[PDB]
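Supplementary Methods S3. Input chains for the assembly prediction are listed below.
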Amino acid sequence: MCMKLESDKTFPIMLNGQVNGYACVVGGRLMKPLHVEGKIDNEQLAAVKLKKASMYDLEYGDVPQNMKSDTLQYTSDKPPGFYNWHHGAVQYENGRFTVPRGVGGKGDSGRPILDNRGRVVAIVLGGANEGTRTALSVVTWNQKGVTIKDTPEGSEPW
Amino acid sequence: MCMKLESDKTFPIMLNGQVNGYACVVGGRLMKPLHVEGKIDNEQLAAVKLKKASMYDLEYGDVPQNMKSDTLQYTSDKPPGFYNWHHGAVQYENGRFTVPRGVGGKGDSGRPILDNRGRVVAIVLGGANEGTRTALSVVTWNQKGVTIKDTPEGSEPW
Amino acid sequence: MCMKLESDKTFPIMLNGQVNGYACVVGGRLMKPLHVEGKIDNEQLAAVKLKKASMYDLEYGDVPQNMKSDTLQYTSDKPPGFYNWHHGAVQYENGRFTVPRGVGGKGDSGRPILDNRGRVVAIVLGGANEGTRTALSVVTWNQKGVTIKDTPEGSEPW
Amino acid sequence: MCMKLESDKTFPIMLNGQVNGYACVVGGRLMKPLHVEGKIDNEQLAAVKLKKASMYDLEYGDVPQNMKSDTLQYTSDKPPGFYNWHHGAVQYENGRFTVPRGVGGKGDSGRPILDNRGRVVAIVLGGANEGTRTALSVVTWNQKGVTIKDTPEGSEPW
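Predicted structure tokens for the full assembly:
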């Protein structure tokens, strides 16, 4: 469903032995979290220059020679309820994302959140424990279309 | 229906003798009426510092970790029609909330008013007897999402 | 008959370790033993002031607003013998109270004795010890209606 | 199996909103960890005065009346492996207590490891994920029977 579109499209961040985060291409732009250290695979886009965003906890750069294809696409249209994920289902309510407790941790701090049509609405960065379902510190796009970072209080980077 | 959803979300307040008004938790925020005195039953949120909002007759505060299973999402979208309720059914004809004649009484002045899909649109404070189908004063949200009061006539605050 | 009627009428006293006595609501007044120590349950009824009658080994006070359905009227009329009781049956032969040996004991100081019509007739505070029929030191009401203290020799209060 | 066996003996420790650890009744001793902060439940086993250890990261005391039910015999007679547990089965291969991946989180820092005959063998404190399979820092009893600590490298309390 969602994993068949995310696979071979979202690229791991190797810390020389284990994955630390994930890097994703949206709109022809490669981006990966700033707090995640390591080297991304495949030589065709591992040498891309990334510039810091600091406030968004992201580093973004343009992937070359394949911007026409292999684009996840992004959309600000976010009707609440039942968005899919590589770890199952996340729910949208009151301007905030919720995931079941327990799932999520280190190594999952860069995965995108897709739609029913393979469209990205989110790039997960961190999470905060909220008792029964944990919230997600995440960059999204508001109604106008500008990137905004939503952080629940006390959110570690998973 | 509404009783099942409001269970384990609506926490009554006792005056150390008996219940004198419920307290609601909406949007990750506890709020109780100003005129309701006494401590609340659930001791986890009985020790939270509560800020006065005496224009709206509510003490409000932030829940510690009950963001899910006490969310009880609110929306300002209130189409005219019928809404479910703790006791019976309420209606939003002509921009006001009216209950049947005999229902409603002292000690029952914190009850939320839910939607068809279980979204709180109203918080009951008091009410007045406008013949049959008595209206009731209530804290709601306008079109822009800003909290307002609706206090019709000489509504005795129970 | 006796077990159903004494339910929600005999209010246990806790010394924060265990039940150690019963406080009884009769005639529109609460009364509990002096020699029992701890905190009465039913926090509505725990907050009332109790004044001491050291002559009858009691603390008595006015009950809260629950006038109706919580009277439990007492009877000065005492036909001899065959009275029901919480732990069994008592007897009123020769103006004294006799029980089978082995009943009662520490932690059971304050349970009432009911008549055939369910009206309370006696509230025990301790007990003597005869070989077969154990005696009970008790607060009863005289044939004129004035309260009296019937205590046999060697009444262990427990 | 062990879930029913250790029930009503493994008393949880409150973080004032949830459970952050477990306490054990071993040989009349109320054993709870020191890093697990908060208030222990009940009142019979909560009002006692505990004495810190700070070398084994436990705290101990005595029960006043519960000796009839304070029945959890500790035993150092320990063949290497195949021991039950609250969650699964633990293995003592190569002189080290071992568990599969993942299981064990916050709220699970104080529960005993039982024997095949319902005897307490170990009291878990923390763990580390390294080597072939993850290992546990735990307080146990050696061959001579004196209290001993076994701790891996980088064994933070989960």
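Helices of chain B lie at 2-6. The interface with chain C takes residues 14, 16-18 of chain B (CB under 8 Å).
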